[PDB]
Structures are given as structure tokens and as C-alpha cells.
Amino acid sequence: GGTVPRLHRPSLQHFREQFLVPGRPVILKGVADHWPCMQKWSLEYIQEIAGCRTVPVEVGSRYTDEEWSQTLMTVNEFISKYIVNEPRDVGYLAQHQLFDQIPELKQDISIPDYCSLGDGEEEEITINAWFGPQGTISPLHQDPQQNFLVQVMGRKYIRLYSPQESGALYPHDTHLLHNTSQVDVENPDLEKFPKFAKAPFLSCILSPGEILFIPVKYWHYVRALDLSFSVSFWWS
Numbered sequence: 001g002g003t004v005p006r007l008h009r010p011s012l013q014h015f016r017e018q019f020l021v022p023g024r025p026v027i028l029k030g031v032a033d034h035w036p037c038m039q040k041w042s043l044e045y046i047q048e049i050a051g052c053r054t055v056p057v058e059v060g061s062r063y064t065d066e067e068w069s070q071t072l073m074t075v076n077e078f079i080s081k082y083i084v085n086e087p088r089d090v091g092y093l094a095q096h097q098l099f100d101q102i103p104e105l106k107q108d109i110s111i112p113d114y115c116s117l118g119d120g121e122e123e124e125i126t127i128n129a130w131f132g133p134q135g136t137i138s139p140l141h142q143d144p145q146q147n148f149l150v151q152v153m154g155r156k157y158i159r160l161y162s163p164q165e166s167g168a169l170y171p172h173d174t175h176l177l178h179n180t181s182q183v184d185v186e187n188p189d190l191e192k193f194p195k196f197a198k199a200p201f202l203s204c205i206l207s208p209g210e211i212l213f214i215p216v217k218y219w220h221y222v223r224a225l226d227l228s229f230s231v232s233f234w235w236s
């Protein structure tokens with residue numbers, strides 16, 4: 001398919017009518033460009049301010065893997081073990097409300113103005129950290145709210161598939177995993193998942209300073225291309 005459209009600081013109104021109401025993904029430029037975190041977040045800064053804090057870490061290349069597990073460690077431990085010193089295994093600090101834990105970090109980001117278009121309240125917006133090495137994969141899944149994914153460090157390759165295309169995504173039947181596809185997007189078993197081939201999609205390479213809008217229930221897959229650090233805002 002095609003690329004996600006990029007737009008330089010679209011107005012509330014036009015963001016609302018063109019993307020939010022109809023549920024169309026878009027990359028917003030010029031918005032997160034000047035937030036303090038783009039200039040200062042780096043390994044040394046992360047260690048200095050968060051080094052000693054305990055954090056959940058996912059070990060294993062993909063969360064749908066049989067051998068995937070979850071563990072806890074300090075930030076310094078995570079960086080030395082899964083990022084810096086030739087990691088034996090894949091470690092991802094994922095989906096963690098790090099700003100709740102380290103409130104000094106929260107001044108480096110801002111809640112995007114477009115969040116105010118939803119009929120929910122500011123403080124109920126969930127802000128998650130996503131930090132890991134090159135090569136981390138988040139398998140094809142859907143979320144229950146709107147999402148603003150801001151890229152601070154590195155790049156990410158992302159594939160988006162519409163919620164209307166769900167039939168072709170072969171979601172798990174378990175209930176726990178109903179929001180996760182059974183397909184490995186980048187090397188799909190087309191003998192087992194033949195409908196996946198036809199399903200149209202959008203893709204992009206999200207880069208630092210860019211905000212991707214992922215509409216509620218829109219399926220998304222993410223693979224970090226470099227040492228990456230993203231911030232997601234879930235809102236309604």
C-alpha cells in the first residue's frame with residue numbers, strides 16, 4: 001500500500017474532520033519537534049535520572065512467542081544487559097507508565113493539544129514509555145483507545161491495517177489475546193493465513209520528532225530499526 005500522510009501542524013478542526021472522526025492514520029510534523037525530550041534524551045541522561053529505578057522488561061523477540069517472559073530490573077541493568085553489552089537476548093522496556101514513576105521526566109514532554117478533541121479527561125490519558133534496542137518487535141495488534149505515538153530516539157517501521165480488515169488478520173480466539181493477530185506480518189504463513197495476502201495496508205518509517213496517529217482499534221505492528229525510545233498517549 002501507500003505511506004501514511006505527513007502534515008505540518010494541522011489545525012484542530014482539520015485534524016478532527018480529516019483524521020479523527022473518520023479514523024484515518026496520519027503523521028503529524030512540527031508538533032513534537034521542539035519538546036525538550038528530543039534534545040536531551042540519551043543514554044547518559046536516562047541513566048542519570050532513572051538509572052536506579054526498577055522497571056518491567058519483556059525478554060524474548062515477540063510477545064506471542066512461547067518463550068517470551070517478563071522480568072524486573074533497574075534501568076542501569078536494562079541498558080547494560082539488553083542494549084549495550086552485546087545482548088544475548090532481546091529486551092524491551094515496553095508499555096510502562098514511566099512518567100508516573102519518574103515525575104521529573106514528565107516535564108520533558110507535553111500532552112498533544114489534539115487530545116482535547118476527545119470526550120475524555122486529561123488525567124485519564126495514559127502515557128507509556130517504549131524503550132529498547134534495535135530489533136524489538138511488537139506484533140500486529142489493536143488497542144481500545146486513540147493513540148499518539150511520539151518518536152524521540154531512533155526509527156521504527158510500522159504497518160497499519162484497518163479494523164474493517166480484521167477477518168484477514170486472523171486474531172487469536174483466546175479472549176486474552178483477541179486483540180492480537182495470529183500472523184507474523186513480515187514473514188506470514190500464507191498456507192495457514194491465506195487471506196492476509198490480500199489485506200491492504202499503510203506503512204511508514206517513523207522518525208524522531210514525529211507523531212503517528214493511530215486510530216482506535218486500528219491494527220498496528222512495530223519494529224524498531226535502531227536503538228529506540230517512543231512515548232505513547234492513549235486517549236479517548
Ligand SMILES: CNC(=N)NCCC[C@H](N)C(=O)O
Pocket residue numbers: 058063092094095137138139141142143
Ligand atoms: C506489550 N508488548 C509490546 N511489546 N507489543 C506492542 C504493544 C502491544 C500491547 N498489547 C498494546 O496494547 O499496544
Ligand SMILES: [Zn+2]
Pocket residue numbers: 141142143220
Ligand atoms: Zn498498540
